[PDB]
Design a protein around this nucleic acid. Structure first.
Lengths: 275, 73, 159, 59, 93, 140, 148
RNA sequence: CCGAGCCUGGUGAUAGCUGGUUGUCCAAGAUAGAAUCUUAGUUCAACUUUAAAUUUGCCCACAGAACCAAAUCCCCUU
């Protein structure tokens, strides 16, 4: 039995850390994790995003409705979230539609509705919410905070900002925190469509141009299991697209996607957003 | 193959390249017309590779495999 | 000397709720100090690592090995206490999930140093039909996996 | 450009078939041209770990 | 087809031959050399004019050498260092 | 044993945590590991010079591919670009060959035009006007 | 080494430089020891230079305590969640100020190996090279040795 | 296991002979010679290391160093 304490204690702390990885702790809220102070951390939220919220409006944006119900249920042995959430949703939908109209004037209203729905969807607002740390400052039913409540809370924060310091700064907020979420993605993984050749056909009927022809522009390996086909979409001796595929049908329909991108102007080359 | 329009400025200070997309004309297009041993050999002849691609690897290599790799771009 | 297998048997779960699939009962058992070596008993243990308990008992009656007799004894013991204690409602509705063997506390004598061996036998039974043998993969699986890799490859070492 | 991510990846890396006529030619010039085209060094994409080869038919 | 003892040492060595590289390398170095001869070909002074034109500078540099060699001595010892070592057991009130 | 060592476990694990992805008693036993974790850290510390060399031959392979696809060879392309005073390096030129081929098409055409302009001045050496892209920018 | 280490690609957090630069740090949790020469340095830093630091960046809340769980330390908590725990056992006030400024300047992403020093997500603007950029098309698109 | 037992002690025999000599980091650092029962070693030297006193140090043309080739001493100056 070797005399001493430093090494025995070093080993004991090492076993404690191996335990903390093997059985990770059950996730419980930062609000009751130590070193917390709500008022200062509200003010830190404000100065981090660098505009002034009215503090009471911001707090009542964070406090939910289900939390109020559960707090009464706890109390039996406050103004809610919802008005702020409705204002924030209304304004975010309207100015997201405005920004995307002014930058993409040719895109149809169904496409721009799909863009706005994508930007205000569950997954993107969940990620922007968590990586903006409203997920810590909100008050909800359980940890982790459910994504519907996160979306509602984030739009309530936007509504509090709207009532606080005006539509221009609120539009800057929506722009700089929701349109950056589409920088990098594509139109047809933001607006999920089916039968893209059909969409091309009806949209050209709106354009009063003849229905396009498909042609097989280039190919390789036509009789193995690794073919390449560029199918081009032509209209009256000239093309609007050409696209790749592992077979003729996939190539044709992907060239239809390319044609739809080029017609709506939402290509890969488009003039990047003016931040 | 090279078909571009090159130029200088007047000063002789910067070069200008002009080079747009040449398209594929309509006429240059065709229209669309509408046992383990045998196993590994027919895979090899179907994919123009050899059989050592298809013979397995043990639990040890499959455990050194990464299963959640980083993703870019 | 460490008896976590028998304590693994006494681990007790919390109660279930009606909207959950039914938990299969798990039965652990152990035979300590067999006068037989750990790797002959490994051959028998690998023989029965997947079999439904009645087929396992068939193979173990008609093997020729001292371990085969000792393992059939252990498996009958575990079936008895599984339908007696751990609430396995059907006697045959068990399958061997783990059958292992490990080495014991061997004893020594002079021949040269001869080591009279002793091994352990561990078994875990589980309610339910035995799992199907996952099919040995076929041409559609290989072609699909190759083409998935070829579609995964990128332009390496640049942007 | 403006293709989807997986069709663009397929078209970038696919396999291409090259016919090379061997009448009167020396086998080493034939071999040089086919060796480049088989390793995939006629692609600006080339890397050794990318399996970027192409097919060659010498008749 | 071998080389007897070691390849490059000894009586029979592996033959080594001069290539276009080795000749061209030797020649560009020899052309640099010819230009070196030309630029050493033309002195400015000679011995009678150079004698004594750097006496001030050489003696200055040697006084610097001599002074920096002679000014070698242990550093000073202060009080504030020793008392800063007492500042280790400092605690807040 | 008046004072003997009690912290040897942690020193051992300082070697073995870098050894854990080895193969064999290299990943378990400490003698074997020490010898083979040293060699791995040395292999790193030389692989940095190696990685610079290897990148630059990959860039030469890619620019060679694209310029041979445009009718040049790599020596002609680099030599005549440096003569026409575009100071692009291999890394950017390789990314321009892969990612931006119309710009590479123009660069190959300019290298060809500079080759034939400079060699027209070479054929008519003596009193001739300076070449069109052979005009150079010299700094006072 | 680099193979005995997880690696990552080069990352933003929330496209942090696009619209506005969002200070990617939330908290510092200091713990200094009252009667301790090991935390003499952290004591001197809390005495001298934490007021101007908190004044210098209002995005982060800085809590300090006395008598930590084991040793004096800082635990920064960043915006993307990752919690960094740096130890200021036996450091001077100068080193503590550089360590704290590094934490407050850094984003919460790891310090594991970064695979590529550049992250364009739209690399090609004239279209990425594929084998049919500049292989010239033919009459009626016939391949070699076509009868027709 | 007797070209002279075995044991205990002197005995931690004597080894110019082989083998072995355990934390991190940085820095200076290479193969005239002499004598020796000495050439499997050592003592001086030469070199090497640290610290100190200083004041000159290394290189080089010219002048210069014997009668019976390549080069080297030497030193005003630089």
């Amino acid at each position: 039995v070797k005399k001493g304490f430093r090494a025995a204690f070093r080993f004991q702390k090492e076993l404690e850390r191996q335990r903390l990885l093997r059985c990770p702790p059950p996730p419980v809220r930062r609000s009751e994790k130590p070193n917390w102070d709500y008022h200062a951390e509200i003010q830190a939220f404000g100065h981090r995003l660098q505009e002034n919220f009215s503090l009471d409006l911001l707090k009542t944006a964070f406090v939910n409705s289900c939390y109020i119900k559960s707090e009464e249920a706890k109390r039996q042995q406050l103004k809610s979230n919802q008005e702020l959430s409705e204002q924030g949703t209304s304004f975010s939908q309207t100015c997201l539609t405005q920004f995307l109209e002014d930058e993409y004037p040719d895109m149809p209203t169904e496409g721009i509705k799909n863009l706005v729905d994508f930007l205000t969807g569950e997954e993107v607002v969940c990620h922007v919410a968590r990586n903006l740390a409203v997920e810590q400052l909100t008050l909800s039913e359980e940890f982790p905070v459910p994504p519907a409540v996160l979306q509602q809370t984030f739009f309530a924060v936007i509504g509090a900002l709207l009532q606080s310091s005006g539509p221009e700064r609120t539009a800057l907020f929506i722009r700089d925190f929701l349109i950056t979420q589409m920088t990098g993605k594509e139109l047809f993984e933001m607006w999920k469509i089916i039968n893209p050749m059909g969409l091309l056909v009806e949209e050209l009927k709106k354009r009063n141009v003849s229905a396009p022809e498909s042609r097989l522009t280039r190919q390789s390996g036509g009789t193995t299991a690794l073919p390449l086909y560029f199918v081009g979409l032509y209209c009256d001796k000239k093309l609007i697209a050409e696209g790749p595929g592992e077979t003729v049908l996939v190539a044709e329909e992907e060239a239809a996607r390319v044609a739809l991108r080029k017609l709506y102007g939402f290509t890969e080359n488009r003039r990047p957003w003016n931040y | 193959n090279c078909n571009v329009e090159l130029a200088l400025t007047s000063d002789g200070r910067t070069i200008v390249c002009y080079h747009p997309s040449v398209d594929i004309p309509y006429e240059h297009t065709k229209p669309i017309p509408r046992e383990e041993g045998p196993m590994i050999e027919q895979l090899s002849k179907m994919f123009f590779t050899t059989k050592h691609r298809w013979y397995p690897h043990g639990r040890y290599h499959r455990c050194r495999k990464n299963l959640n790799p980083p993703k870019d771009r | 000397i460490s008896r976590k297998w028998e304590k693994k048997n006494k681990i007790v779960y919390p109660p279930q709720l009606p909207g959950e699939p039914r938990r299969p009962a798990e039965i652990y058992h152990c035979r300590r100090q067999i006068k037989y070596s750990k790797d002959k008993m490994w051959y028998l243990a690998k023989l029965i690592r997947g079999m439904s308990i009645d087929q396992a008992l068939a193979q173990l009656e008609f093997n020729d090995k001292k371990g085969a007799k000792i393992i059939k004894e252990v498996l009958l013991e575990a079936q008895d206490m599984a339908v007696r204690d751990h609430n396995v409602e059907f006697r045959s509705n068990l399958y061997i999930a783990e059958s292992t063997s490990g080495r014991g506390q061997c004893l020594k004598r002079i021949r040269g140093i001869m080591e009279k061996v002793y091994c352990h036998y561990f078994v875990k039974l589980v309610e339910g039909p035995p799992p199907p043998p996952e099919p040995p993969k076929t041409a559609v699986a290989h072609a699909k996996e190759y083409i998935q890799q070829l579609r995964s490859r990128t332009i390496v070492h640049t942007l | 450009s403006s293709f989807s991510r997986a069709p663009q990846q397929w078209a970038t890396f696919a396999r291409i078939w090259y016919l090379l006529d061997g009448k009167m030619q020396p086998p080493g010039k034939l071999a040089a041209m086919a060796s480049i085209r088989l390793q995939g060094l006629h692609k600006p994409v080339y890397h050794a770990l990318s399996d970027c080869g192409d097919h060659v038919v010498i008749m | 087809g071998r080389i007897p003892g070691r390849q490059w040492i000894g009586k029979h060595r592996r033959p080594r031959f001069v290539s276009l590289r080795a000749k061209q390398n030797m020649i560009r170095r020899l052309e640099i050399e010819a230009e070196n001869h030309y630029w050493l070909s033309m002195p400015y002074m000679t011995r009678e004019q150079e004698r004594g034109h750097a006496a001030v500078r050489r003696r200055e540099a040697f006084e610097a050498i001599k002074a920096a060699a002679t000014s070698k001595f242990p550093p000073h010892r202060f009080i504030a260092d020793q008392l800063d070592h007492l500042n280790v057991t400092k605690k807040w009130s | 044993l008046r004072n003997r060592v009690t912290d040897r476990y942690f020193r051992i694990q300082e070697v073995l945590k870098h050894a854990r992805h080895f193969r064999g008693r290299k990943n378990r036993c400490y003698r074997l590991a020490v010898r083979t974790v040293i060699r791995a850290f040395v292999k790193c510390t030389k692989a940095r010079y190696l990685k610079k060399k290897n990148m630059r031959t990959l860039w030469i392979n890619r620019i060679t591919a694209a310029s041979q696809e445009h009718g040049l060879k790599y020596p002609a392309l680099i030599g005549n670009l440096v003569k026409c005073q575009v100071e692009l390096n291999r890394k950017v030129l390789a990314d321009l060959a892969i990612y931006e081929p119309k710009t590479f098409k123009s660069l190959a055409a300019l290298a060809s035009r500079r080759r034939h302009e400079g060699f027209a001045a070479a054929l008519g050496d003596g009193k001739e006007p300076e070449g069109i892209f052979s005009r150079v920018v010299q700094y006072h | 080494t680099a193979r005995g280490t997880p690696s990552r690609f080069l990352a933003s957090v929330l496209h942090n430089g696009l619209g506005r630069y969002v200070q990617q740090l939330q908290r510092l949790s200091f713990s200094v020891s009252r009667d301790g020469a090991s935390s003499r340095g952290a004591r001197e830093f809390v005495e001298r230079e934490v007021i101007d630091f908190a004044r210098r960046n209002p995005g982060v809340v800085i809590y300090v305590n006395s008598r930590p769980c084991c040793v004096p330390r800082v635990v920064a908590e960043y915006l993307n969640g990752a919690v960094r725990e740096e130890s200021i056992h036996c450091k001077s006030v100068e080193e503590i100020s550089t360590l704290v400024q590094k934490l407050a300047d850094q984003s919460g992403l790891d310090v594991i190996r970064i695979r590529k020093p550049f992250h364009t997500d739209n690399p090609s603007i004239q279209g990425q090279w594929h084998p049919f950029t500049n292989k010239p098309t033919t009459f009626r698109g016939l391949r070699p040795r076509e009868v027709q």
